[PDB]
Amino acid sequence: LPRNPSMADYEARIFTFGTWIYSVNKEQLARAGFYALGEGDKVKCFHCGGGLTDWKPSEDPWEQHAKWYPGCKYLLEQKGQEYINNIHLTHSLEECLVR
Numbered sequence: 444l445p446r447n448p449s450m451a452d453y454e455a456r457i458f459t460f461g462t463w464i465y466s467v468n469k470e471q472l473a474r475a476g477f478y479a480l481g482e483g484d485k486v487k488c489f490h491c492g493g494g495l496t497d498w499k500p501s502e503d504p505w506e507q508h509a510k511w512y513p514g515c516k517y518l519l520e521q522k523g524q525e526y527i528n529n530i531h532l533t534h535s536l537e538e539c540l541v542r
C-alpha cells in the first residue's frame with residue numbers, strides 16, 4: 444500500500460540525494476525509506492508518506508521514523524514491533540527521569 448510506488452526501490456531513493464549538503468547520512472536515510480524533496484533537508488518516507496525535516500547531528504533516521512510515524516508498514520517489517528515500541532518507551536523514560 445505504498446504512497447509512492449516510483450520511490451519503492453532503494454536505488455530510486457539515494458538517486459534523490461545527488462546534491463545533499465547536509466551531514467545526515469544519505470545511504471542511512473534511503474535505507475530507512477526516505478527520499479529528498481530538493482527543499483532544504485526535508486524528506487518523505489516512500490511508504491507512509493511521513494515527512495521529516497530539520498535533522499540534528501545525533502539523529503538516527505530509523506529512530507526518527509519510529510518517533511513520528513510508527514504506523515508505517517515499511518518500518519514495521521524492517522525493524523519490528525519491539526523496536527518501534529522501545530523508541531517510544533525511551534522517550535517516555537527520559538521525560539519521566541528528567542525531574
Ligand SMILES: CC[C@H](N)C(=O)N[C@@H]1C(=O)N2[C@@H](CC[C@@H]1CO)CC[C@H]2C(=O)NC(c1ccccc1)c1ccccc1
Pocket residue numbers: 485486487494495496497498499502507511
Ligand atoms: C527529523 C528529526 C528532527 N529533529 C525533528 O524531530 N523534526 C520534527 C519534524 O520533522 N516533525 C515533527 C515536529 C517538528 C520537528 C522539527 O522541529 C512533527 C512531524 C514532523 C513534520 O511533519 N515536519 C514537517 C515540517 C515542515 C516545516 C517545518 C517544520 C516541520 C515536514 C512536512 C513535510 C515534509 C517534511 C517535513
Ligand SMILES: [Zn+2]
Pocket residue numbers: 476488489490491492493508512515516517518
Ligand atoms: Zn514510513
